[PDB]
């Protein structure tokens, strides 16, 4: 068959519609890893963009960043931090989170491969990789990924609540 996101509200149901797009503050509109569907707008986001890196840590009611300013109070935004960020900062922060999770699947990072992996321009990928280097999550030079430091210190610094 074909692989793409969809929803089973009960175990004997299947719903898919091209109207339920990916719409996430990272600006990437493709499925990639763990995806989560917003309770309010029924559109899809990358869990990692909302600092969710384990399907057991994901909320049962996900409220995306667009919806955070319009749902009643009892529906908490999944990542309140994002609501405080300026738009260009917001996109850069979610992309950084995607980059951190993506780097954990690579032994070495090469700029064209990395740009394609994340769907970004080369100059953006250079910016990300130079940041990974300063943090110590990859080496200076491709660039060997320091997987242990990334998964331990890096996830603590950027994802742990
Ligand atoms: Ni399914
Ligand atoms: Zn995203
Ligand atoms: Zn929403």
Measured distance CA(98)–CA(49) in Å, rounded: 6
Measured distance CA(46)–CA(120) in Å, rounded: 16
Domain ranges of the chain: 1-81, 85-161
How determined? Answer: X-ray
Measured distance CA(137)–CA(33) in Å, rounded: 21
Ligand 3: centre distance to CA 44 (Å): 8
Ligand 3: centre distance to CA 124 (Å): 27
Ligand 3: centre distance to CA 62 (Å): 8
Topology annotation, domain 85-161:
Arc Repressor Mutant, subunit A (1.10.10)
Q: What is the resolution of this structure in A?
A: 1.8
Residue 67 annotated as binding? Answer: yes
- Assigned token pair, 5: 């996101």
Tokens 């260009």 appear where? 88
**Whether CATH 3.40.30.10 fits 1-81:** no
Least Cα distance to 127 among 160, 96, 153 occurs for 96
Ligand 1: centre distance to CA 6 (Å): 6
From residue 103, alpha-carbon distances to 17, 29, 118, 123 in Å are: 31, 20, 10, 17
């Amino acid at each position: 068959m074909k692989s793409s996101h969809h929803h089973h509200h009960h175990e004997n149901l299947y719903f898919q519609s091209n109207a339920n797009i990916v719409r996430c503050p990272c600006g990437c509109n493709e499925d990639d890893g763990l995806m989560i569907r917003c309770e309010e707008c029924k559109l899809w986001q990358h869990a990692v963009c909302f600092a969710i890196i384990s399907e057991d840590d994901a909320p049962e009611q996900h409220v995306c960043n667009q919806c955070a300013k319009i749902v009643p109070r009892h529906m908490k935004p999944t990542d309140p931090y994002l609501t405080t960020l300026a738009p260009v900062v917001l996109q850069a922060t979610c992309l950084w989170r995607r980059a951190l999770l993506a780097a954990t699947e690579m032994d070495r990072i090469l700029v064209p491969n990395f740009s394609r992996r994340l769907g970004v321009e080369i100059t953006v990928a250079h910016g990300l990789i130079n940041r990974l280097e300063k943090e110590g999550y990859c080496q200076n030079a491709g660039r060997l990924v320091n997987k242990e430091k990334l998964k331990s210190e890096g996830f603590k610094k950027y994802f742990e609540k």
